[PDB]
């Protein structure tokens, strides 16, 4: 355990957090993994969805390479303040935080080859502009965009670690209103005027379920409309009955529409 | 020995097929974030049943009855390694009397009303017409009020089926 202590002291001593790995060299490639713990508040009112994730970043830093210790050094999370970490940020987020009980849910893991794993437990609300014209018979595309704030492709490069297996846990997700038909990962360099900036994007296609609406809204409307036709089979002279039936069907339909407007 | 006082909001997936006659097992799971099974392992101080103690007065539940707790331990194999996960499951059963008095029983009496129309003389056409259509309106109001007090799940709960069947009954009576 002591030898590990002087090893860690050697690594951290003379370490400049201001300089990225391969500062003068080629760009540092940052692999990314996500494990979706939950997707909770898919809000049509606010045009956003809440998502909890384990977000891992992998990158090789030769300064932190060590030898003579054949095990992966999982260090206390506070050392993340002492190491360089990427400039990653979620472009479309509105409110995000790291869970902080019992401690800040961070993980720093060094490997003998110099690889650094940086894991964060993040709950973030992300904007998802919904076209609800076909509501409730609608399908939404909700995306999470990941970008580097202050680095271009000549300095930092993003990729999905493990290919299409980079994002996991989507198969285990289920929403009360939606079902995840498909999820996609795409990596691309946004060619901004200053330069090309790396970007990753995780998209979900959500299909709304209509069991709610077949019972709540469509069936009472259909049956009230059917009841409105009973007036045709009543004699023309029975003015009170036919009038009461028709106008009370109007009132019931108004009640349905108004209370549906309130609830939805 | 390291003691803390915490307030934890935790996810509880619920199968609301049998609402309000449904029962749930809400989990509380914890473990090390960074250290895998080969580095840090959690254990219960005493026997697992007696290592999670609920206070006698500590049941702040309105619509649920906390039947008991089940304490266990397990392993989770994540993308970063295997982790020991210590879990508790609180077993909750919903209280049904509210939905009996507020939803089921008014719906039953409204269906009984809609059926009482058959005992009026057939020549009271306006009376029976108004009676049936106003009964349909009453069921509409009751159904709206009932579903105001549910979460926005997709599939049909038991009380939804009860309301739909009663609504079909008043429709068929008219």
């Amino acid at each position, epitope marked *: 355990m002591s030898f590990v202590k002087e090893t860690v002291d050697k690594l951290l001593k003379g370490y400049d957090i201001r300089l990225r790995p391969d500062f003068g060299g080629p760009p540092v490639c940052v692999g990314m993994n996500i494990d979706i713990a939950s997707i909770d508040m898919v809000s049509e009112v606010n045009m956003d969805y809440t998502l909890t994730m384990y977000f891992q970043q992998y990158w090789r830093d030769k300064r932190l390479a060590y030898s003579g210790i054949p095990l992966n050094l999982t260090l206390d999370n506070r050392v993340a303040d002492q190491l360089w970490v990427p400039d990653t940020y979620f472009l479309n987020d509105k409110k995000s935080f790291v869970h902080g009980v019992t401690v800040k849910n961070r993980m720093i893991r060094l490997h003998p080859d110099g690889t650094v794993l940086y894991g964060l437990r993040i709950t973030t609300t992300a904007a998802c502009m919904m076209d609800l014209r076909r509501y409730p018979l609608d399908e939404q595309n909700c995306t999470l965009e990941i970008e580097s704030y202050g680095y271009t492709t000549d300095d930092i490069e993003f990729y999905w670690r493990g290919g299409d297996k980079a994002v996991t846990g989507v*198969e*285990r997700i*289920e929403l009360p209103q939606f079902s995840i038909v498909e999820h996609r990962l795409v990596s691309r360099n946004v060619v901004f005027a200053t330069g090309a900036y790396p970007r990753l994007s995780l998209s979900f296609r959500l299909k709304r379920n209509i069991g709610y609406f077949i019972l709540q809204t469509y069936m009472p409307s259909i049956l009230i409309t059917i009841l409105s036709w009973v007036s045709f089979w009543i004699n023309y002279d029975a003015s009170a009955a036919r009038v009461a039936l028709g106008i009370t069907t109007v009132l019931t339909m108004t009640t349905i529409n108004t209370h549906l407007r309130e609830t939805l | 020995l390291y003691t803390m006082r915490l307030t934890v909001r935790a996810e509880c*997936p619920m*199968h609301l097929e049998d609402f309000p006659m449904d*029962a*749930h*097992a809400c*989990p509380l*799971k914890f473990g090390s974030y960074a250290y895998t099974r080969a580095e840090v392992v959690y254990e219960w101080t005493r026997e697992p049943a007696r290592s999670v103690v609920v206070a006698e007065d500590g049941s702040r539940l309105n619509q649920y009855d906390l*039947l*008991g707790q*089940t304490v*266990d*331990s*397990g*392993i*989770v*194999q*994540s993308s970063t390694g295997e982790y020991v*996960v210590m*879990t508790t*499951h609180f*077993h909750l059963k919903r209280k049904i009397g509210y939905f009996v008095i507020q939803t089921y029983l008014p719906c039953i009496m409204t269906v009984i009303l809609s059926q009482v129309s058959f005992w009026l003389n057939r020549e009271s056409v306006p009376a029976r017409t108004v009676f049936g259509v106003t009964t349909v309106l009453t069921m509409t109001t009751l159904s709206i009020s009932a579903r105001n007090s549910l979460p926005k799940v997709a599939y049909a709960t038991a009380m939804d089926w009860f309301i739909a069947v009663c609504y079909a009954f008043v429709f068929s009576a008219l």
Partner: nanobody
Amino acid sequence: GSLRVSCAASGRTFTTYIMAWFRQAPGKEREFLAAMDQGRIQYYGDSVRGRFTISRDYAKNSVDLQLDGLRPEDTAVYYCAAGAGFWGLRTASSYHYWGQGTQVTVSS
């Protein structure tokens, strides 16, 4: 000897349910073996801890049990079960769905 017992579920999606395996040797006693919940958390019985491994395919809605290190006393009928664990997660009464079973025999 090594073996793998798979269980495919049809008729309902068991993403939120706890999928488990039980064993029944001759003499009519059902024994809990392994279980996995929605969080991929694996619970095991003491008798088969570290030997049998339980996994789930949520896309295919199936649960697999890999059996390594079989001994003659493991000869029994293995049942696949599903259901939310109420008062349970180690009791057969908490599972509302059960499989036909699979007979496994070991000879020395």
